[PDB]
Each structure stands twice: as C-alpha cells, then as structure tokens.
C-alpha cells in the first residue's frame, strides 16, 4: 500500500546528484584517524599538518573514483551492470598497480 520506488531508480538520482556536487565523501574524522594509524609504523610520533591530512583526502578519493569509474566499463564489458570483486582485479591489472 505505501508508495515505493522501483529498485535502482533511487541510485540514478544520486548518480546525478553526487556527480554534480564537489564536496568530500569519506567521513572526515575517521579518515584522518586512519592516516595516523597507517603512518604510525613508518615513523614515531608523527604530527600531520592538518592542511596535509585533507591533502590526502582530495588525492586518494580522486583515485578511488578513478577506479570505480574504470571497473564500471569492465562490468559493462562483461554484459553485467553490478561491479564485482573479480572486476577490480582486472581493472588494477591493466594499469599495472597490482601485478
């Protein structure tokens, strides 16, 4: 009885929404708390200039999007629509970032 959108149509709304805007996507505070954790063993007691914690965010996210875009052809090239883990292993392989 209650109205429901069909599956998939809500996504297309976002694809036209998030591709329009230009703010960040990953939650800020955890993403910094990751960079300290991962950087913890390269050196002791590192202090990131807070200008350069976002500078990763605007430089790693413009890399994931450069990935999800690029698998999306491959999942399309395999007659499918959904991306699957088997897709990325290809996608990083042509570039040369895993092999």
């Amino acid at each position: 009885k209650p109205h429901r959108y069909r599956p998939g149509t809500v996504a297309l709304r976002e694809i036209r929404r998030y591709q329009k805007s230009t703010e960040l996507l990953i939650r800020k505070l955890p993403f910094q708390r990751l960079v300290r954790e991962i950087a913890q063993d390269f050196k002791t007691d590192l202090r990131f200039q807070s200008s350069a914690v976002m500078a990763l965010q605007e430089a790693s996210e413009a890399y994931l999007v450069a990935l999800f875009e690029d698998t999306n052809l491959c999942a399309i090239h395999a007659k499918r629509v959904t991306i699957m883990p088997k897709d990325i292993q290809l996608a990083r392989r042509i570039r040369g970032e895993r092999a």
């Binding site: 708390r33 350069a52 990763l56 890399y63 991306i83």
Partner: protein
C-alpha cells in the same frame, strides 16, 4: 595524554555507506555485497605508497611534521600531481 595513539580498527573507518557515495560518484548503479572488503584492501595499499614517500621527505629535512608542501611532492612522483596546495 603524553603516550599512545589511535592504532586499531581505523581501517573500518570507511563504512559501507561511506564507500557507497564514492561508487555513486563514479557512476555505478548496482553494488555487490563483497566490494567493500576489497577496496579497503586497495585503498590502504595506495595510502601506503603515498605516506611512505611522504614521510621520507620529512625525515630527511629533519622535521617531525608532514606538510602539504610534501604530500604534494610525494604525489608528484606517482603521476598524481595535486594542484591547489602548492607550487
């Protein structure tokens, strides 16, 4: 405090909706149930090869802070030069 740091579970910081927005920006209509645990591998691996170059600059100049004028200079090595923080 003067000791300890955030060194556990942060890789779970990228929650399921958090990546979902990213995939939406790329233009993926339908997302699989298993992609999440895979990029969290990919995302961390890339971050290693940027900080590890980023830190190596700071250690050389005897600093104890990573400055954006260096994360830019680490990134420039890997092709992904990053306008808008320095030059």
């Amino acid at each position: 405090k003067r000791h300890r740091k955030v060194l556990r579970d942060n890789i779970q910081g990228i929650t399921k909706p958090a990546i979902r927005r990213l995939a939406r920006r790329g233009g993926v209509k339908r997302i699989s149930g298993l992609i999440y645990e895979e990029t969290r591998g990919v995302l961390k691996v890339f971050l290693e090869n940027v900080i590890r170059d980023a830190v190596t600059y700071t250690e050389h100049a005897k600093r104890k802070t990573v400055t954006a004028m260096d994360v830019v200079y680490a990134l420039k090595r890997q092709g992904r030069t990053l306008y808008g923080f320095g030059g």
